[PDB]
């Protein structure tokens, strides 16, 4: 079939690993420097954490091939399970020698680093989760994402998603015949 869904998941894995490093969701001791898209990134070497990120994106992949993803959101939650930050990846797919996709995806990875300079430091003890905004309403077909048997998905509710008048931090916008994608941050006032 077509493959831009394959490169988006590996990109999202790299982006999630980097966000956990830049926003300091996990200690530096579990991160190691790797190269992806010819840029240095900090990848997690924690096995259980890696299996969670991979199991999450292994279910997102079939939805990308079907063109059923508006947004993939990484949500940082404080110790009271309240969203303090949201990294929103708005995704649009318009109708193989394509390192152009990688050089375009590499620019999104390069932008994530600036979050250390423009965002205020998160409270200690934060956790994270991933929100997937399907194009077709998720309530219509809940089984489409249940591709891994021991990794079930549920509908989020407003406590996991809602932030009261959050500050919007635009990071990067890209439009192309290949890929259209925006990355921005919804930050709590605090």
């Amino acid at each position: 079939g077509q493959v831009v869904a394959d490169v988006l998941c590996e990109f999202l894995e790299v982006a999630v690993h980097l966000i956990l490093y830049v926003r300091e969701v996990y200690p530096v001791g579990i991160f190691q420097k790797r190269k992806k898209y010819n840029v240095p990134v900090q990848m997690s070497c924690h096995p259980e954490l890696n299996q969670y990120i991979q199991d999450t994106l292994h279910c997102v992949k079939p939805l990308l091939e079907k063109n059923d993803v508006e947004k993939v959101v990484v949500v940082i939650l404080d110790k009271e399970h309240r969203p303090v930050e949201k990294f929103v990846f708005e995704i649009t797919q318009p109708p193989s020698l394509l390192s152009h996709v990688e050089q375009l995806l590499a620019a999104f990875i390069l932008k994530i680093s600036v979050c250390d300079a423009v965002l205020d430091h998160n409270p200690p003890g934060c956790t994270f989760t991933v929100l997937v905004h399907t194009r077709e309403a998720a309530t219509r077909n809940m089984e489409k994402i249940q591709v891994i048997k021991d990794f079930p998905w549920i509908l989020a509710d407003e406590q996991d998603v809602h932030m009261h008048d959050p500050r919007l931090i635009p990071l990067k916008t890209m439009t192309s015949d290949i890929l259209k994608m925006q990355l921005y941050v919804e930050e709590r006032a605090h």
Binding site: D55, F151, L155, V161
Partner: peptide, 23 residues
């Protein structure tokens, strides 16, 4: 800059039932 898909309270997103390991 404008977000393409503003926050819609009607169409709730999906979330993994499990939680990542604590730091």
């Amino acid at each position: 800059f404008i977000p393409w898909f503003p926050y819609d309270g009607s169409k709730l997103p999906l979330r993994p039932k499990r939680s990542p390991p604590a730091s």
